[PDB]
mmCIF file with all atom_site columns, C-alpha atoms and ligand atoms in Angstrom:
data_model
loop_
_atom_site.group_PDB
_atom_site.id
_atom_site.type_symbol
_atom_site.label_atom_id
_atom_site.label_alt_id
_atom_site.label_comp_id
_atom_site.label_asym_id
_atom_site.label_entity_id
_atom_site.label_seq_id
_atom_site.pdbx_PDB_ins_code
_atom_site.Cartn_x
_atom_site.Cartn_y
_atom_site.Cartn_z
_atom_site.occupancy
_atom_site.B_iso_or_equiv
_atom_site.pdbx_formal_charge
_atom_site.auth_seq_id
_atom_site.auth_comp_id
_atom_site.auth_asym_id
_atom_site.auth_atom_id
_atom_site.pdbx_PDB_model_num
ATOM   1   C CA  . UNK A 1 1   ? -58.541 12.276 -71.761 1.00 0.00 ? 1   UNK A CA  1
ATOM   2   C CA  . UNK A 1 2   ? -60.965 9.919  -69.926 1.00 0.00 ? 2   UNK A CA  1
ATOM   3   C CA  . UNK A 1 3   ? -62.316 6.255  -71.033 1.00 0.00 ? 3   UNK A CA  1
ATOM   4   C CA  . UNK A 1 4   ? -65.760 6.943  -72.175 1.00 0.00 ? 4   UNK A CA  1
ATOM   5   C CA  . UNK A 1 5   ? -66.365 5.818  -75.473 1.00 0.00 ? 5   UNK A CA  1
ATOM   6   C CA  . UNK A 1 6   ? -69.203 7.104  -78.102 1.00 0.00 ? 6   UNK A CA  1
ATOM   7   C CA  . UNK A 1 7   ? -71.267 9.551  -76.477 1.00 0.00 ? 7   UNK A CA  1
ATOM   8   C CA  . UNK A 1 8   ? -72.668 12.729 -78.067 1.00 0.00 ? 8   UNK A CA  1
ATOM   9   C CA  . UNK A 1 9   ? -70.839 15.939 -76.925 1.00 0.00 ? 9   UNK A CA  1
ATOM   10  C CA  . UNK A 1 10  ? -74.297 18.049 -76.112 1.00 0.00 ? 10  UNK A CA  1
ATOM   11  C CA  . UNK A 1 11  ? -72.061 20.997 -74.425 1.00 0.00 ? 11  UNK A CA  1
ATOM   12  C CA  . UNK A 1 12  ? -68.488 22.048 -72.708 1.00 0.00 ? 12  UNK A CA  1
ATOM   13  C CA  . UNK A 1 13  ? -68.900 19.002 -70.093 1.00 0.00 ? 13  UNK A CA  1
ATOM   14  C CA  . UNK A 1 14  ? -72.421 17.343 -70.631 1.00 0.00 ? 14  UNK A CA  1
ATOM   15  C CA  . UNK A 1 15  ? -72.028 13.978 -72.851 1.00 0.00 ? 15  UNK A CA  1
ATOM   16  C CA  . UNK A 1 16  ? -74.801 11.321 -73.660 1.00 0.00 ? 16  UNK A CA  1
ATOM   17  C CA  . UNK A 1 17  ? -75.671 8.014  -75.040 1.00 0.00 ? 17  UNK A CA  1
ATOM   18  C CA  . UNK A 1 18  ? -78.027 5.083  -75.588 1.00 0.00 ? 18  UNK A CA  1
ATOM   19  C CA  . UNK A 1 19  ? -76.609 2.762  -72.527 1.00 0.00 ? 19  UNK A CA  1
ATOM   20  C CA  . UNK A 1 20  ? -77.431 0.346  -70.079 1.00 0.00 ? 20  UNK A CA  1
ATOM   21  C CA  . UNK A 1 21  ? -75.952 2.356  -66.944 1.00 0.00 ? 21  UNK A CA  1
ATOM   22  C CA  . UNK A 1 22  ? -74.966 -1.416 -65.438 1.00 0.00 ? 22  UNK A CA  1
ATOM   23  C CA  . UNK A 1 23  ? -73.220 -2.487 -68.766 1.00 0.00 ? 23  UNK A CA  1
ATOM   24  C CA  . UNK A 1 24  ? -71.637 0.630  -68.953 1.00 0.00 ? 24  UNK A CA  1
ATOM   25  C CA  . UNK A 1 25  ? -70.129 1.145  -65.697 1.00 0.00 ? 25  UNK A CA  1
ATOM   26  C CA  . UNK A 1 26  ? -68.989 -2.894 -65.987 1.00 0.00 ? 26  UNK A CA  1
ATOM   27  C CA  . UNK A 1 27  ? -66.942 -1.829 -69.021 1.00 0.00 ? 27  UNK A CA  1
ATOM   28  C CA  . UNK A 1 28  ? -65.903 1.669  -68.076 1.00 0.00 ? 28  UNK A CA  1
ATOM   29  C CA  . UNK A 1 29  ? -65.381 1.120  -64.101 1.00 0.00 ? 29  UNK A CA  1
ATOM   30  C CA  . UNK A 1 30  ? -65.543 4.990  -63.417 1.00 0.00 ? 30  UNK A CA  1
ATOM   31  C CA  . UNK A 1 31  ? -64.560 6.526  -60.951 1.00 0.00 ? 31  UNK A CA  1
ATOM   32  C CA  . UNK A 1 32  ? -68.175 7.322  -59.966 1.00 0.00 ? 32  UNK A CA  1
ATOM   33  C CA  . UNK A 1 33  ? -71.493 6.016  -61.000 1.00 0.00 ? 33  UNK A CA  1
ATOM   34  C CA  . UNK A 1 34  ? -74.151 7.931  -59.792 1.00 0.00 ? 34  UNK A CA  1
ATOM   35  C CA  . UNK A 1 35  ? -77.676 6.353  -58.664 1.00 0.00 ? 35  UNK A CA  1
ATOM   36  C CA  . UNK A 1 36  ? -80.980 6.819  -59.259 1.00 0.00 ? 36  UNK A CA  1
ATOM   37  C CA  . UNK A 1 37  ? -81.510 6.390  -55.056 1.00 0.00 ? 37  UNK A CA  1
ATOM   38  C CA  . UNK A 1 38  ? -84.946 7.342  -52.705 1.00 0.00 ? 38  UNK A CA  1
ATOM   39  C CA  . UNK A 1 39  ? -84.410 8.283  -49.299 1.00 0.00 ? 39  UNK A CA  1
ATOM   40  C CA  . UNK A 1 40  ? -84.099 4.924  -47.969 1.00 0.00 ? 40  UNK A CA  1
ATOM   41  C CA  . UNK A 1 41  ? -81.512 3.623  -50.520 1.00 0.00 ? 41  UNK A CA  1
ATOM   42  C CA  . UNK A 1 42  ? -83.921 0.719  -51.306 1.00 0.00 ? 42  UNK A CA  1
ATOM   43  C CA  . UNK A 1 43  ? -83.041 -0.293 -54.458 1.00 0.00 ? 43  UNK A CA  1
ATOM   44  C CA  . UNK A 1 44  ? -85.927 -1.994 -56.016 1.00 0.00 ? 44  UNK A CA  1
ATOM   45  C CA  . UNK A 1 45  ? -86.197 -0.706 -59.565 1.00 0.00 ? 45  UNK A CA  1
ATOM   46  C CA  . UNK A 1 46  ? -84.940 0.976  -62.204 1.00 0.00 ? 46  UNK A CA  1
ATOM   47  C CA  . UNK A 1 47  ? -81.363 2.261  -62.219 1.00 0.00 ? 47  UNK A CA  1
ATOM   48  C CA  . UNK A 1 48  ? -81.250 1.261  -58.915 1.00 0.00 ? 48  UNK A CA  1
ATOM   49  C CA  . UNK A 1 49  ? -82.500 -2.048 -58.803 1.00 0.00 ? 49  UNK A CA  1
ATOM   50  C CA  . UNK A 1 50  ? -80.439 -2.775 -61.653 1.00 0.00 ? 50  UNK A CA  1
ATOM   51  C CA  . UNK A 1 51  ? -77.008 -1.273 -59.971 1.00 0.00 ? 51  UNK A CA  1
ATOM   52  C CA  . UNK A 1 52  ? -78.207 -3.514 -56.922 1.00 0.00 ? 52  UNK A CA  1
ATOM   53  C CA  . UNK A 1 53  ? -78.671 -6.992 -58.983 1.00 0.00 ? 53  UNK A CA  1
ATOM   54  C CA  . UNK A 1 54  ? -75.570 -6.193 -60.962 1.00 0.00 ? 54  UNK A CA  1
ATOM   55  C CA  . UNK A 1 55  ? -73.562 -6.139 -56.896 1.00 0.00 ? 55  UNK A CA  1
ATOM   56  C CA  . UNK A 1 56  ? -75.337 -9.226 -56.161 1.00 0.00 ? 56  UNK A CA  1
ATOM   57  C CA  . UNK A 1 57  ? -77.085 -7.121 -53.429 1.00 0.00 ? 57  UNK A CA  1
ATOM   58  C CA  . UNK A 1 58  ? -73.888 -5.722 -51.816 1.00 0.00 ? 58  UNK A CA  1
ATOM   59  C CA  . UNK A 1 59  ? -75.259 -2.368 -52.590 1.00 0.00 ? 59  UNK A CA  1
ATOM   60  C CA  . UNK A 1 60  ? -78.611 -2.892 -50.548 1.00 0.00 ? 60  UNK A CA  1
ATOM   61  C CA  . UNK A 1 61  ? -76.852 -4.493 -47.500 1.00 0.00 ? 61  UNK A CA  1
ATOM   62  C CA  . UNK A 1 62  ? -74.123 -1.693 -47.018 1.00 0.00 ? 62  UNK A CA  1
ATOM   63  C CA  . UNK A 1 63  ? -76.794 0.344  -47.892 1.00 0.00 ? 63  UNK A CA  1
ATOM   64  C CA  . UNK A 1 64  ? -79.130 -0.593 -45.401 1.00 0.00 ? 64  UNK A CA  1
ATOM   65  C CA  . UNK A 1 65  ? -76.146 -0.029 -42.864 1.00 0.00 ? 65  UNK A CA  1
ATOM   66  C CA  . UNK A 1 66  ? -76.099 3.520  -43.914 1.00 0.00 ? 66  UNK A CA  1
ATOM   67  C CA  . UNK A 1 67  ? -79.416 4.179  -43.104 1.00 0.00 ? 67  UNK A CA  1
ATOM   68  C CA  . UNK A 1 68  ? -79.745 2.252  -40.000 1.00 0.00 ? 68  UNK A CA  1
ATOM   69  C CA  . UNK A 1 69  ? -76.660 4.293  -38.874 1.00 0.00 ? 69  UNK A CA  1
ATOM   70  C CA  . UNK A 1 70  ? -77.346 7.881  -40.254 1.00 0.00 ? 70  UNK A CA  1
ATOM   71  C CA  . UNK A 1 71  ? -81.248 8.003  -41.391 1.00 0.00 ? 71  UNK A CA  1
ATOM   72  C CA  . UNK A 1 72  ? -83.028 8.309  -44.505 1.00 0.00 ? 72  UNK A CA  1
ATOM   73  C CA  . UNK A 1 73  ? -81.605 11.205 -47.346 1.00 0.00 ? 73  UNK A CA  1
ATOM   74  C CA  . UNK A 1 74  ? -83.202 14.295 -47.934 1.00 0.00 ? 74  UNK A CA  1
ATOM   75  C CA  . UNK A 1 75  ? -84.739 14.816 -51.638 1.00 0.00 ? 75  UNK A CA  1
ATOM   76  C CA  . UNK A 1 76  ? -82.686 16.856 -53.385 1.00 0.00 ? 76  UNK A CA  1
ATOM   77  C CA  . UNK A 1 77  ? -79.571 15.025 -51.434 1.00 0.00 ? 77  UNK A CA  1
ATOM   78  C CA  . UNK A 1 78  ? -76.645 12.302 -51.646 1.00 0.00 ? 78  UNK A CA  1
ATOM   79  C CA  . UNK A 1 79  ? -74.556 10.681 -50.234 1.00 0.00 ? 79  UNK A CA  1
ATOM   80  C CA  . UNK A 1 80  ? -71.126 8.116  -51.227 1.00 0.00 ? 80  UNK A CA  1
ATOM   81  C CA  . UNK A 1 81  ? -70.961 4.614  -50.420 1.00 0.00 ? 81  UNK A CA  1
ATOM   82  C CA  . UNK A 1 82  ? -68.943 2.196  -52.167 1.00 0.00 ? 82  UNK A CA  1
ATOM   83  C CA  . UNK A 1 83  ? -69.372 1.716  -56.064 1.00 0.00 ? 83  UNK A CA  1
ATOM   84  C CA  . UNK A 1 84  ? -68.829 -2.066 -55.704 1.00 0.00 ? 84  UNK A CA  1
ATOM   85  C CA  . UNK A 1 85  ? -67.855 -4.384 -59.082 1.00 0.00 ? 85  UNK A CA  1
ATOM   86  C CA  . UNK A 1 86  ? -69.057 -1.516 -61.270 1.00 0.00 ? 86  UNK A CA  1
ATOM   87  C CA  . UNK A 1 87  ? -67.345 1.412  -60.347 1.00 0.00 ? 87  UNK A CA  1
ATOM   88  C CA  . UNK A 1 88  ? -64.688 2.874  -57.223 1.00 0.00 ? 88  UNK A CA  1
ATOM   89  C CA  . UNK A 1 89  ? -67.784 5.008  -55.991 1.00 0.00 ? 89  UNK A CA  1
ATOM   90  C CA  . UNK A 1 90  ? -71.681 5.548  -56.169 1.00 0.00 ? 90  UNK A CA  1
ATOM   91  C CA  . UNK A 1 91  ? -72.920 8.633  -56.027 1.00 0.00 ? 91  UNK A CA  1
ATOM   92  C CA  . UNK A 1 92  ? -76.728 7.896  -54.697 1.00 0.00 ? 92  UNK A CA  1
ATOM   93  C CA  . UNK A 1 93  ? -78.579 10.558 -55.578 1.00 0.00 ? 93  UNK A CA  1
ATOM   94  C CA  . UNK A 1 94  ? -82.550 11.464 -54.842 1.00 0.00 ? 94  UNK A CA  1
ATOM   95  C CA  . UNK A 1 95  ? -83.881 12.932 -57.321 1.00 0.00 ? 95  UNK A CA  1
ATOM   96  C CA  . UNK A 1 96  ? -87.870 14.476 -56.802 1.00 0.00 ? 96  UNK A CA  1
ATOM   97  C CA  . UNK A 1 97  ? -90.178 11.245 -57.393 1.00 0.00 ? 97  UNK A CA  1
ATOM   98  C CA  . UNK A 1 98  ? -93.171 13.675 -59.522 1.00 0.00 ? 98  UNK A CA  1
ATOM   99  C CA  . UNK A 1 99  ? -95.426 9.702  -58.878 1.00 0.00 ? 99  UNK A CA  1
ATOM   100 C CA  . UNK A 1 100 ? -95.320 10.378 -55.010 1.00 0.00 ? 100 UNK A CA  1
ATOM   101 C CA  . UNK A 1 101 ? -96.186 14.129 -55.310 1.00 0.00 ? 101 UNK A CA  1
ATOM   102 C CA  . UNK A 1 102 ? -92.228 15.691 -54.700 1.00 0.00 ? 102 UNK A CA  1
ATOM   103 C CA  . UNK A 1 103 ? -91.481 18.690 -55.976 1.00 0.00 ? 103 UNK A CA  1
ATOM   104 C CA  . UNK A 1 104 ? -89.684 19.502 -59.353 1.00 0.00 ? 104 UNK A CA  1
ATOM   105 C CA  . UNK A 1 105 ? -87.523 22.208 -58.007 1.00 0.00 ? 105 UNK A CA  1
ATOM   106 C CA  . UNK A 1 106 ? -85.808 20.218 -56.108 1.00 0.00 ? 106 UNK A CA  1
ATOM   107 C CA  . UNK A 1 107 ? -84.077 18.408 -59.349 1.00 0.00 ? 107 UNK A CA  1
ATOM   108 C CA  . UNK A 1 108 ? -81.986 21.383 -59.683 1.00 0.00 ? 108 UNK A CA  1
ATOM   109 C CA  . UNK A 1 109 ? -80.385 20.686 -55.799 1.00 0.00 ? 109 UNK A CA  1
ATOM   110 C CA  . UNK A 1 110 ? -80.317 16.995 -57.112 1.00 0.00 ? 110 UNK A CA  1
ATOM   111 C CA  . UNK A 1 111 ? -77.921 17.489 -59.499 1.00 0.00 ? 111 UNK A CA  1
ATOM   112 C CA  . UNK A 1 112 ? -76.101 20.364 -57.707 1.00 0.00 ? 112 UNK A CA  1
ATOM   113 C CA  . UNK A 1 113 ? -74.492 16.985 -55.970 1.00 0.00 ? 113 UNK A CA  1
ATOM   114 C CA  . UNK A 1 114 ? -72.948 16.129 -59.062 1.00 0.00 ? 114 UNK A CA  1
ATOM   115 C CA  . UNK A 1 115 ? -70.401 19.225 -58.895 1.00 0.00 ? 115 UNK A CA  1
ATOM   116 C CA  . UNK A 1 116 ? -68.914 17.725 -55.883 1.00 0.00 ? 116 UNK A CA  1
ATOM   117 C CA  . UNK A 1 117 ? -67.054 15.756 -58.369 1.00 0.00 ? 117 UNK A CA  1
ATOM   118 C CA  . UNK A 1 118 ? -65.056 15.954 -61.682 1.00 0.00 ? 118 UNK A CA  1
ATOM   119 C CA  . UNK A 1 119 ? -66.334 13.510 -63.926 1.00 0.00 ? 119 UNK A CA  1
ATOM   120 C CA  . UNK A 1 120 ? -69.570 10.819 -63.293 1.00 0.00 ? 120 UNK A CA  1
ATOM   121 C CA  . UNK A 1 121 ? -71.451 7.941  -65.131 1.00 0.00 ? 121 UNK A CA  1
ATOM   122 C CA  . UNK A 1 122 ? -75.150 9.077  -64.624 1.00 0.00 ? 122 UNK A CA  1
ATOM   123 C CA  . UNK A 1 123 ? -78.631 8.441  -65.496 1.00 0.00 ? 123 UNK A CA  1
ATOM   124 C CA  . UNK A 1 124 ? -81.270 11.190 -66.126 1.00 0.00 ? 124 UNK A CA  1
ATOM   125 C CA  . UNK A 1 125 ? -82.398 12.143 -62.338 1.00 0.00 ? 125 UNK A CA  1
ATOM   126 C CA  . UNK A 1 126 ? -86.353 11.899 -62.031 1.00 0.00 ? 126 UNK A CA  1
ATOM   127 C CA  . UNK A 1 127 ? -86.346 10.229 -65.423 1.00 0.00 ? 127 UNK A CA  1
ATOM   128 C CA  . UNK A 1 128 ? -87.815 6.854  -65.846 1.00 0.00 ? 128 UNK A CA  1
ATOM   129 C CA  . UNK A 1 129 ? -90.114 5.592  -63.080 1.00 0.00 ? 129 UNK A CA  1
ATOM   130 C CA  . UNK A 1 130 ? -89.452 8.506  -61.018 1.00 0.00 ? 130 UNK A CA  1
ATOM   131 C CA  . UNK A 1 131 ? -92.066 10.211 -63.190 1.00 0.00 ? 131 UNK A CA  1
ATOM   132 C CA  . UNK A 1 132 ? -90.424 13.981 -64.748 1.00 0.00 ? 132 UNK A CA  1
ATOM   133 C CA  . UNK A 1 133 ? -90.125 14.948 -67.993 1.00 0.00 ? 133 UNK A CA  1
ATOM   134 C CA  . UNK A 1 134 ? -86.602 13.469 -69.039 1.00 0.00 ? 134 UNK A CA  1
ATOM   135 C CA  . UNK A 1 135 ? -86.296 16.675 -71.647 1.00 0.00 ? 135 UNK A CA  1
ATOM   136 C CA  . UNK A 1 136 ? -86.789 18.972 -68.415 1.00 0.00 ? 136 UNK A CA  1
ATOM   137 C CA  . UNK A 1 137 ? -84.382 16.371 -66.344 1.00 0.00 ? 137 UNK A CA  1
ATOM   138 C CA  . UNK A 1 138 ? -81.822 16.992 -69.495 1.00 0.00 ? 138 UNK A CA  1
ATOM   139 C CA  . UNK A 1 139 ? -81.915 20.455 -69.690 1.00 0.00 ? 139 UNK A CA  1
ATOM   140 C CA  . UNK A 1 140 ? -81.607 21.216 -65.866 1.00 0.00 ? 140 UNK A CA  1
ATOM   141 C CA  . UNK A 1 141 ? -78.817 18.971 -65.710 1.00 0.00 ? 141 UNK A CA  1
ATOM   142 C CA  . UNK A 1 142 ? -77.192 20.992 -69.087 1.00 0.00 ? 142 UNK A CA  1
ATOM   143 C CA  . UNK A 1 143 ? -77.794 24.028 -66.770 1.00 0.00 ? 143 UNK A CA  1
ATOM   144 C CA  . UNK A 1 144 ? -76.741 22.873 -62.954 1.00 0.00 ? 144 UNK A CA  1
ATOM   145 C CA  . UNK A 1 145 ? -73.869 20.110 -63.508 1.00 0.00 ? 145 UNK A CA  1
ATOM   146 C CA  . UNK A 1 146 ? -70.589 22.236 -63.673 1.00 0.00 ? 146 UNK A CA  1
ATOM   147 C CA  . UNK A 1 147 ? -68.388 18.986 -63.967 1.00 0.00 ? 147 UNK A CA  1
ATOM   148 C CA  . UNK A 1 148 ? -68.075 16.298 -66.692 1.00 0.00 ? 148 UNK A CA  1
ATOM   149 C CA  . UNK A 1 149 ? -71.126 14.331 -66.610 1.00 0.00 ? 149 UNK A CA  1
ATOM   150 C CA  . UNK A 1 150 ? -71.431 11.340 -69.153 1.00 0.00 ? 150 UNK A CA  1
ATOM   151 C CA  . UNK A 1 151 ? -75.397 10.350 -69.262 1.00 0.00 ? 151 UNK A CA  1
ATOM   152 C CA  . UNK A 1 152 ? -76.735 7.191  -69.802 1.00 0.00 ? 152 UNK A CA  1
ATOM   153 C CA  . UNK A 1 153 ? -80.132 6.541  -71.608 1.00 0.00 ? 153 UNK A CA  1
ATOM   154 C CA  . UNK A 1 154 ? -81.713 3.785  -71.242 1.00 0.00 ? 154 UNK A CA  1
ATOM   155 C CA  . UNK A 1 155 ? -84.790 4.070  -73.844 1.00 0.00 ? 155 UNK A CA  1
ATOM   156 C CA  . UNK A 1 156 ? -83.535 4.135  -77.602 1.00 0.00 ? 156 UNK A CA  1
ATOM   157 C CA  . UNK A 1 157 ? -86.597 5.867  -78.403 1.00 0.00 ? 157 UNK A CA  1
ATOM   158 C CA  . UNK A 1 158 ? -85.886 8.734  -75.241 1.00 0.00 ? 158 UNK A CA  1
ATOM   159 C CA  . UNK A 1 159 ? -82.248 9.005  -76.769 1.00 0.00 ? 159 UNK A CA  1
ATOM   160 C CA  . UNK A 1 160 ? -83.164 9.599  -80.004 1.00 0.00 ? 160 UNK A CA  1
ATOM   161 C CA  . UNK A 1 161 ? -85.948 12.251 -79.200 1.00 0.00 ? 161 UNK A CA  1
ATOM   162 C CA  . UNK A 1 162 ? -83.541 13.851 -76.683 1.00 0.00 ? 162 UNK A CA  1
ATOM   163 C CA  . UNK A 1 163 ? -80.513 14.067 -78.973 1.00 0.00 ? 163 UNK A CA  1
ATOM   164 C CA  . UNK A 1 164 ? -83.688 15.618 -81.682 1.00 0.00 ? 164 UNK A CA  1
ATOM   165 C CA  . UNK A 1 165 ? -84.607 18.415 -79.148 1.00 0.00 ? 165 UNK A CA  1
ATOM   166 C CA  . UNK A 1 166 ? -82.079 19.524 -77.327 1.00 0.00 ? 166 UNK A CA  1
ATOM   167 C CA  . UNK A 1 167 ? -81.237 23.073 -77.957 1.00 0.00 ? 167 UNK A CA  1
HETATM 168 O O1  . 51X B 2 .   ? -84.268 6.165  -70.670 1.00 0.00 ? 201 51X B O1  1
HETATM 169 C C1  . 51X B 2 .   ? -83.930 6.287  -69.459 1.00 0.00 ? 201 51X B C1  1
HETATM 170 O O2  . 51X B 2 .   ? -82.758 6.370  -69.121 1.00 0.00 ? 201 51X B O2  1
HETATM 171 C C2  . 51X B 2 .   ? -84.972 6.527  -68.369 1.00 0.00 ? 201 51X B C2  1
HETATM 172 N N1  . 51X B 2 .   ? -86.255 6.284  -68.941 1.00 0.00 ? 201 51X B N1  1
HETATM 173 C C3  . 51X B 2 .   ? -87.214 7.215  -69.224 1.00 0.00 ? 201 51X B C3  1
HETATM 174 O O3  . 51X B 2 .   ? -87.141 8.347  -68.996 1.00 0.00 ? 201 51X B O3  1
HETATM 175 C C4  . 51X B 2 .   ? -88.382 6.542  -69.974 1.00 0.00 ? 201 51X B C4  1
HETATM 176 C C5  . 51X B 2 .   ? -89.537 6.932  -70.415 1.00 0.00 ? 201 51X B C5  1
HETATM 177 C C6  . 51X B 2 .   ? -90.405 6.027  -71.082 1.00 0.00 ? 201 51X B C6  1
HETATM 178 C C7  . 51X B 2 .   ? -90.030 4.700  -71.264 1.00 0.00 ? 201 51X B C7  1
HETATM 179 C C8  . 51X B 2 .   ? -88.817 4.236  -70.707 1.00 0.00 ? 201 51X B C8  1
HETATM 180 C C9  . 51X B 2 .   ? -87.986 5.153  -70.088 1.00 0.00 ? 201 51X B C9  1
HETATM 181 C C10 . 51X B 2 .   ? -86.628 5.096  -69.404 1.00 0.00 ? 201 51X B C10 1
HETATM 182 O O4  . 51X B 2 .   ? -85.981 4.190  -69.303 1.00 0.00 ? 201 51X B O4  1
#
């Protein structure tokens, strides 16, 4: 038994709901939250720059140690920092950004960083602003992620026309 509360059971270990990622790892405090990272770990936007405000920036300064220490992330990779007032780790993973030309087979590798560990908090990865098909971004993740992976989305509109379509 785990604390996750309300989500749609869509297979053996792949979960989802219509959440704020931030709200939900405030109330849940998983073990890890995974992020929605580029290869710099600047958070600006989306999942990130909302983990980021909701740390009061602690996430972008330690993150900004990482890279000064180690370089940027591959796409496709991750790393684990510290999940801050939301969570005891993040997960920052980069998912293929389709609006600066990346490619879509990498998604698969993305979430292949997810079965490092037994259960995550997680937003679609490429979904959003980082410009892939969030049906695609469901399904790979249905077919990759091994581990028990409770998805947050965002859109109510997305949720409702993934929950619709998924097969
Ligand atoms: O729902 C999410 O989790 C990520 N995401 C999308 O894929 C999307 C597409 C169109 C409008 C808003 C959103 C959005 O937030």
């Amino acid at each position: 038994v785990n604390s996750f509360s309300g989500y749609l059971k869509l297979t053996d270990n792949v979960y989802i709901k219509n959440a704020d990622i931030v709200e939900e790892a405030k109330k849940v405090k998983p073990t890890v939250v995974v992020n929605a990272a580029n290869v710099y770990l600047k958070h600006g936007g989306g999942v990130a720059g909302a983990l980021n405000k909701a740390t009061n920036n602690a996430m972008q300064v330690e993150s900004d140690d990482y890279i000064a220490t180690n370089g940027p992330l591959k796409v496709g990779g991750s790393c684990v920092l510290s999940g801050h007032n939301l969570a005891k780790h993040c997960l920052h993973v980069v998912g293929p950004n389709v609006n600066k030309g990346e490619d879509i087979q990498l998604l698969k590798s993305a979430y292949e960083n997810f079965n490092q560990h037994e259960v995550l908090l997680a937003p679609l990865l490429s979904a959003g602003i980082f410009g892939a098909d969030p049906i695609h971004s469901l399904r790979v993740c249905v077919d990759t992620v091994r581990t028990n992976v409770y998805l947050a989305v965002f859109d109510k509109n997305l949720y409702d026309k993934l929950v619709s379509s998924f097969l």
